[PDB]
């Protein structure tokens, strides 16, 4: 499927107590979450080509990769990792993190038939999903 486009969140299950377990301090946990209910989101992709930029004031996230090859970003709550995204299924990718030791971490999207964008973050047990559609 083709993720392209601006995507505007409107759902958030688990964010904050994924920050939470993950035992970011609560005074820049509720920065965090408020600049997280209102990101912008970009994406660009180009067959296993992909552009994701995800943007609040507080933190913007800008990642340019090729399926299949591996790629440096941070986990959610700060960390310097490596990626390594692979599709799953035809229509939902996986990213598998290692740091650069602790909670094995993830992130997953997938389009529905409807063109809403399904995120996942995972650490260990504790699952965030956040719902978008497209602008
Ligand atoms: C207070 C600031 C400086 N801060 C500090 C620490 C952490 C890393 C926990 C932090 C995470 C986010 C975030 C986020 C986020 C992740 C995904 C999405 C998304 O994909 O929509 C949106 C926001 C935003 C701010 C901070």
Redesign the pocket.
């Known amino acids: 499927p083709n993720f392209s486009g601006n995507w505007k ?1 409107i759902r958030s299950e688990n964010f904050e107590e994924l ?1 939470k377990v993950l035992g ?1 301090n609560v005074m ?2 509720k ?2 979450v408020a ?2 209910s209102k ?1 912008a ?1 970009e994406i660009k992709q180009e067959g296993d080509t992909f552009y994701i930029k ?1 943007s ?1 004031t ?2 913007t ?1 800008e990642i340019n990769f090729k399926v299949g090859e591996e790629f440096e970003e941070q986990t ?3 960390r310097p990792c490596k990626s390594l995204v692979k599709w799953e299924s035809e229509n939902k990718m996986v990213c598998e993190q290692k740091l650069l030791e602790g909670p094995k971490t993830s992130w997953t999207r997938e389009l529905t038939n409807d063109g809403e964008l399904i ?1 996942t ?1 995972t650490a260990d047990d504790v699952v965030c999903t ?1 719902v978008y559609v497209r602008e």
Do not use: E, K, N, W
């Open positions: 969140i920050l970011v820049l946990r920065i965090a600049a997280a990101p989101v995800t609040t507080v933190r996230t959610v709550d700060g995120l973050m956040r």
